[PDB]
From Swiss-Prot:
The lineage of its organism: Eukaryota, Metazoa, Chordata, Craniata, Vertebrata. Keywords: Disease variant, DNA damage, DNA repair, DNA replication, DNA synthesis, DNA-binding, DNA-directed DNA polymerase, Isopeptide bond, Magnesium, Metal-binding, Mutator protein, Nucleotidyltransferase, Nucleus, Schiff base, Transferase, Ubl conjugation, Xeroderma pigmentosum, Zinc, Zinc-finger. This is DNA polymerase eta. The keyword Transport does not apply. Transmembrane segments: none annotated. It comes from Homo sapiens (Human).
Amino acid sequence: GPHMATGQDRVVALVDMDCFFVQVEQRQNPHLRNKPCAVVQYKSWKGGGIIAVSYEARAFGVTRSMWADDAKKLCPDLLLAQVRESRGKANLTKYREASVEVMEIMSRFAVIERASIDEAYVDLTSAVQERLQKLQGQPISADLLPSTYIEGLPQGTVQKEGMRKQGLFQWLDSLQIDNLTSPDLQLTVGAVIVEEMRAAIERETGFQCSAGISHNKVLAKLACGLNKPNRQTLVSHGSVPQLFSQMPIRKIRSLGGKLGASVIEILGIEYMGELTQFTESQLQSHFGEKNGSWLYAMCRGIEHDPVKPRQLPKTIGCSKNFPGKTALATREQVQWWLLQLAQELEERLTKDRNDNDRVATQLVVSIRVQGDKRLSSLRRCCALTRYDAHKMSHDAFTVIKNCNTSTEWSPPLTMLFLCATKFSAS
DNA sequence: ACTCGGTCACT
DNA sequence: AGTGACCG
């Protein structure tokens, strides 16, 4: 209607590096390039755990959270790159640093929110407006969108590239003919900018990535996953009804867990589109005020979560699991590993201070004991006055020590977790 | 023995 | 301050 908002106010993108750890190792070792490849941490137990898988390898059914020995069964010629091991634990410095490479390049084009080590949201609203004035009254060539997919098109050719182009042509012709909306043009320009951003990333780092372009973060992330790897997908406001009509609820971000399952069970539906039938009040009564309102808008393709201008992580942490018989049963053992964790943490913290002009003021300590269903048996915190590994390990020990029911440590600890938080300018 | 990272909501 | 859901 005249007064119903359509959530077409912004142009937002979600960029995801494809199989990012694998790409990092592949850039470093040319032998791994263009091959079924995976990144493994630890080697002793069942060949180690796969944490990242190349698309060649995925074709064989190889997945993350899979034992290397089992991956080798599915893909005999699988090549493996090992995560760096420092102080007896996995060290992800190489990947964090690679992430910084990419993020810095992205920031040149637009404002970014660092979602994760391999994921970032991008707010293109301002950039699109500027590009439009420069580009005013100028048709947009398909050549400007060499890797772009328009979801829902074509509508009305057997090769995938043929289909992509036909879909693109229909979209562009419509744009061109004045049949589409102002918001549609804005998304289109956003896509052009993302193509340029992704080209810059590849040229300057060698890394490829997939991206989604839409009017909000949720649609952008969903769009990103539609065409991978090394491709980008534009999801228009108009494409939502058809797209959501067969979209499982769990596919929407934040709906992949218990809430999503409750939605399906309580309402007796499967797909995101089915949510439109319910009143905002109905949804709120079942799932709470905040969730209900969010669901009511989201099923209609509307989401208002802002892309936060955050280039750096809010927290800096390290942890190690001690599963099965490796569980820590002695006091000296626990202290030694706390020291290992504290030492890596100190190095990363000092680096962070020099690079980013900030200091952490809080240290969080978490542990898990054997037989405990919960991920965390306890979570305690204390002041972080100095970037000193010995002091940090000592303090962490002090806060968790009464946890021991009773030289020996009982019950044995299956997890140790240190996190630096509450940063201040410096 | 589905790691080791992380952000955000509830109370 | 502490627990926990959610993401991959």
